[model samples]
Target: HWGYGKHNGPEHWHKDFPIAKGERQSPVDIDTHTAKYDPSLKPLSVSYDQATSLRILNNGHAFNVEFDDSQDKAVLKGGPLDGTYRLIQFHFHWGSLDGQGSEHTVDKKKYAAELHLVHWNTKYGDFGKAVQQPDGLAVLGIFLKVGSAKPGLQKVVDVLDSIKTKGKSADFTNFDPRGLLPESLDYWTYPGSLPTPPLLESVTWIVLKEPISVSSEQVLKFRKLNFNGEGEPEELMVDNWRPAQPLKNRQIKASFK
Candidate 1:
């Protein structure tokens, strides 16, 4: 299993998954001054039905909140996408302490954490199948900054204790992921791969420019999560973010002026 470790980290990923070094690798540094502001970009149309949230799980890598994508109940549309994209799940990447974390950095500045809302194109039938196609995935990236306690995230935080160990999961429903997003939907778009293993070059990234607030206390709570399962030596699930990848020849298109 690939992990964020010394021997099995991003550097060693290419050995097992050769695609890790692919040209479209993700978590690139977003130089705002170099980013192209495209007026043609449309406003994001996000429709997330809280009821579709099935459960939350500590998948060793991150705490992923899964969703029921059998219908168009929770989907994203109208933002650099031709059709509706189904919400499969959402997870987070964070640091062990301050001064680091987040996948995509803005002008070389890293945030405390980053949230990835994974989605799949309806045209591909399912996530497993969609992940192989170029235009099959649309990930919504949100930056998390340490500040005041974000009331919207409290629901997710309260349940963290229950899923502290790897493979641990609990029923989590009626929680709107939309509430965790910033007020402004302004974002940057680019073609990139998943920041993790197998690092498929299928994601059309929509990274929001504005950051949401989360108290320092909440940050500590997240660090309490363990990478190993019960009865195993505990490894704190922090510093789970991958280092920034080379931008290659991609263009970061901004939706705002």
Candidate 2:
């Protein structure tokens, strides 16, 4: 089982999932000092409808909020994306402490948490088909810091109790995710892969430069979630973020000059 624990953590993943050591892996540390300005990167446009949210689930890893993607009702276009990519799901990677939780860091600095909005190109038919292609996925990453709360995020946090254990889920409809976004959409763009297992090298990473807010009280609730199933030894799902990966000749580009 690939987990955040030392025995089965990111360091151990390379054995079962060789791609863990592959080039262009995700959650790389963004060194702003070396990030060059890119005039080619355009502003990102996101379209979402609250009606598309299906449910939230605890997948023995992190809690994921699934969205209905049979259509392009919610999508991400522009900003390093080749075409309109449909929103399939969104989840967060966090830690046990207020000082560290985010998967990706800035100049080796950590944040309270990280939000990943997963999207896939519809041209490939299904996400399964797209996952293998180099330009298959586009993940929008937003950082969260400890401070005032974001009401939009509060709606999701309120339901954490409903999905406390692995495999648990709850109805999560009419939820607007934009509430989790900061006022600025400025970001860093790079070619990367899924931060977790089956870590396919197919994601275009757009990490927002501005971070959203999540209170200290609200952020710690995630530790209460059990990584184990109903009958297994209880283990909290804290420190679920993968460490920053190697840059491996990759360049991180800034959307703002």
Candidate 3:
């Protein structure tokens, strides 16, 4: 399996996973001036049930908050989507510095971190099956800036101490994923792939234009997370973001004028 280390980093990913160099890779730069305004795009419809939140785990790559996605209790509709997409999990990507960790950048500028809410299309039945087809997944991307502490995010940060090492997990119920999003629903949409290995080209990327604030202290807490386990030498869980890929022939559309 591919990892974000010096030896097994993204530069060497294509040796094993050919899709890393595929046509529709993710983490592309979003230039607002270049993006065309689509007035026909409907307002994003996000409905998340706090009770559907199951648990949070240190998945070696990042901390993932899983949800009970068997039912349509939580879903994302409208806004560059043709069908309902179920929220399965969500996670973050960050770098070592306070100002540089996000995967997707706006005008070539990096943020403190980036939040991704992963979802699968209902028409595809399950994530495994959905991932094989184009338009099988939908990921909502939110940029995180360094500023005042986010009270809503504090709830997620408090549990980081316990799950600092890879493979560790804890109860994370009654958490609404919507609390993490920005006030503006306006977003830039494009066709892209998973930034990680097995880079499936089945995702519809919906990146919000506005960024949410996070305190420097909160960002430091993310640095405390370790990529290794208790026995292995500690490795700081940072710089997990992939650089922006070629935009190819894809056109980015804005939800608002």
Candidate 4:
């Protein structure tokens, strides 16, 4: 079960994570001529103090957020934002290959993958129902780069050793999702869709151009996780990310305002 490297990389990951088929992956080296995709200067707000109805489930592959109905403690509203969007569930996708775990792809270059922080409008009442509306959901995409160790991810990596086994999850009760966000909130936004299954097109994606860092050892740990199910041996599920799709006239605006 050792001696795993990029050779047995992402090309072999689809065997475990199925959602890879529907993922509208990002970080594909977006072209500069693509009308300059940007993000709104909307203040990034998160109500972490609000007791969230957060539920964590170890579905076949990766952890899935069941629900999070927290109140409006932190809301991102202003220039591009006006409504109150509350934090929902947060999750990630990784790859057997150390450098391919994102969903929101760029022109065609896939990096270490992407991390998503899903949020829904408080006015919508329900996420499942809100995603159907045009402005119901808001998702932030953070790219991962493999190089000089990234101290930003230390909080999550520190506890990964305890949950290295597939399907095994601790309370993760003390962890704050906001801690994962990079120091630079400057980003690009667009009216895109979900990067995962049931890919809905109601999200406002804020993908950061600058990627954070992660250790080779930490990236390797992702390869050991299995999307099969709880109790499944730590089979590598590295190719957990999805390939990019055609933008189809979708406007990807940035936070240059």
How many steric overlaps are in each model, in order? 0, 0, 1, 39
lDDT string, candidate 3, 105-168, tens digits = 8888999999999999999899999988898999999999999998888888999998999899
lDDT, candidate 1, 1-257, per-residue tens? 79998888888899999998889999899999999999999999998854388999999989999999998888999879989899999998999976788989999999999999999999989999999999999999999999899998999999999999999999998888878889999999999999998899999999998999999988888899998999999899999999999999999999999
Candidates 1 and 2: which is better by lDDT?
A: 1
lDDT of every predicted structure (CA atoms): 0.92, 0.91, 0.91, 0.60
TM-score of 4: 0.75
What overall lDDT, based on C-alpha atoms, would model 3 receive against the true structure?
Answer: 0.91
Error of 3 at 66 (Å): 0.3
Top model number, lDDT: 1
Better of 1 and 4 by lDDT: 1
User: Candidate 2: misplaced stretches above 4 Å?
Assistant: none
- Evaluate model 4: give its lDDT: 0.60
Tell me the spans in candidate 3 whose CA falls farther than 4 Å from its real position. Answer: none
Tens-digit lDDT track of model 4 for 1-257? 21124453334444554433333333234554564633436555545554343445454446544334655654544435558776667667776676566766566667785777777877888777888777888876788878766664565566554555455565554455555567777666666666544455677776777677777876776566554445655455556565565565555666554
lDDT of 1 at 140: 97
* C-alpha RMSD between model 1 and the true structure: 0.9
